[PDB]
Write an enzyme that holds these catalytic residues in place. Structure first.
Site, PDB file in Angstrom:
ATOM      1  N   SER A   1       0.796  -1.227   0.000  1.00  0.00           N
ATOM      2  CA  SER A   1       0.000   0.000   0.000  1.00  0.00           C
ATOM      3  C   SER A   1       0.833   1.284   0.000  1.00  0.00           C
ATOM      4  CB  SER A   1      -0.936   0.009   1.203  1.00  0.00           C
ATOM      5  OG  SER A   1      -1.978  -0.931   1.010  1.00  0.00           O
TER       6      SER A   1
ATOM      7  N   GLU B   1      -4.639  -7.171  -6.243  1.00  0.00           N
ATOM      8  CA  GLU B   1      -3.661  -8.021  -6.928  1.00  0.00           C
ATOM      9  C   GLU B   1      -2.227  -7.513  -6.776  1.00  0.00           C
ATOM     10  OE1 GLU B   1      -6.514  -6.794  -8.339  1.00  0.00           O
ATOM     11  OE2 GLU B   1      -7.707  -8.566  -8.843  1.00  0.00           O
TER      12      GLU B   1
END
Length: 263
Positions: free
Chosen positions: A44, A142
């Site tokens: 992230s 993904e």
């Protein structure tokens, strides 16, 4: 550099994987570097740069941050704790950017990637500021697969640090957008056990975390403002060879402390 680097080598041996660190002292030009040009998965942590790319678009598109994004239920994916709350109302681009940075909100990130032309559009923004290492190739979730040897969705600690410096401290963005990026990073809620844990409570920190989970893969990058001194920029990235290798926030915090102490 062997003496500067020695503690990281011992830390990554106990960790059972690879640690990558780059720290820059913007007052003296001092650096600390360890595997700083190796590639690690972004997880992230790209969401910080995504918000900077949104801010850059807002310089060309007045009011962009104000525009509501109204989404349907299949925009929601796990780890979207803010955007899940506003399914029945929509969110502004400003709110989505804050959520992506400060809560790592996945649906928020996907919505903003769509606004920017997908992962390739974010990559193109990073190229525009001279970052030739960063690549975002896939979407949430993904992009978190973190498969060893996969070059997709990776950058290097040095490239992350240099791009973060350009955007938060340099003039890559106009001053209002620049402070907005800094303010979003300073409000991050997910990094208390990573770089922030290495920093005296008196000093402001803005940061963005990544946690793929698998393959011992996790990271954090930050700007640190020591009181009355020039700021420091740094990035700590980890990975490991087996899928069930555990990531460790304590390892990230320990590597941050070694970098900070070493400047």
């Amino acid at each position: 550099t062997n003496l500067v680097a020695e503690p990281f080598a011992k830390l990554e041996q106990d960790f059972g994987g690879s640690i990558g660190v780059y720290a820059m002292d913007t007052g003296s030009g001092a650096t600390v570097s360890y595997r700083a040009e190796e590639r690690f998965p972004l997880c992230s942590s790209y969401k910080g740069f995504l918000a900077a790319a949104v801010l850059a678009r807002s310089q060309q598109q007045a009011g962009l941050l104000d525009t509501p994004i109204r989404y349907g239920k299949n925009a929601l994916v796990p780890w979207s704790p803010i955007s899940e709350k506003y399914l029945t109302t929509g969110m502004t681009v400003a709110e989505l950017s804050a959520a992506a940075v400060q809560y790592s909100d996945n649906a928020a990130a996907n919505l903003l990637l769509k606004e920017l032309g997908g992962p390739a559009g974010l990559t193109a923004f990073m190229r525009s500021i001279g970052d030739t290492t960063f690549r975002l190739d896939r979407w949430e979730l993904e992009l978190n697969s973190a498969i060893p040897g996969d070059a997709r969705d990776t950058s290097s600690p040095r490239a992350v640090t240099e791009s973060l410096q350009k955007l938060t401290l340099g003039s890559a963005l106009a001053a209002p957008q620049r402070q907005q990026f800094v303010d979003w990073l300073k409000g991050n809620t997910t990094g208390n056990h990573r770089i922030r844990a290495a920093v005296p409570a008196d000093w402001a920190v803005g940061d963005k975390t990544g946690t793929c989970g698998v393959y011992g893969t996790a990271n954090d990058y930050a700007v640190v403002w020591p009181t009355g001194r020039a700021p420091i920029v740094l990035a700590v990235y980890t990975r490991a060879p087996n899928k069930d290798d555990k990531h460790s926030e304590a390892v990230i915090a320990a590597a941050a402390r070694l970098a900070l102490e070493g400047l």
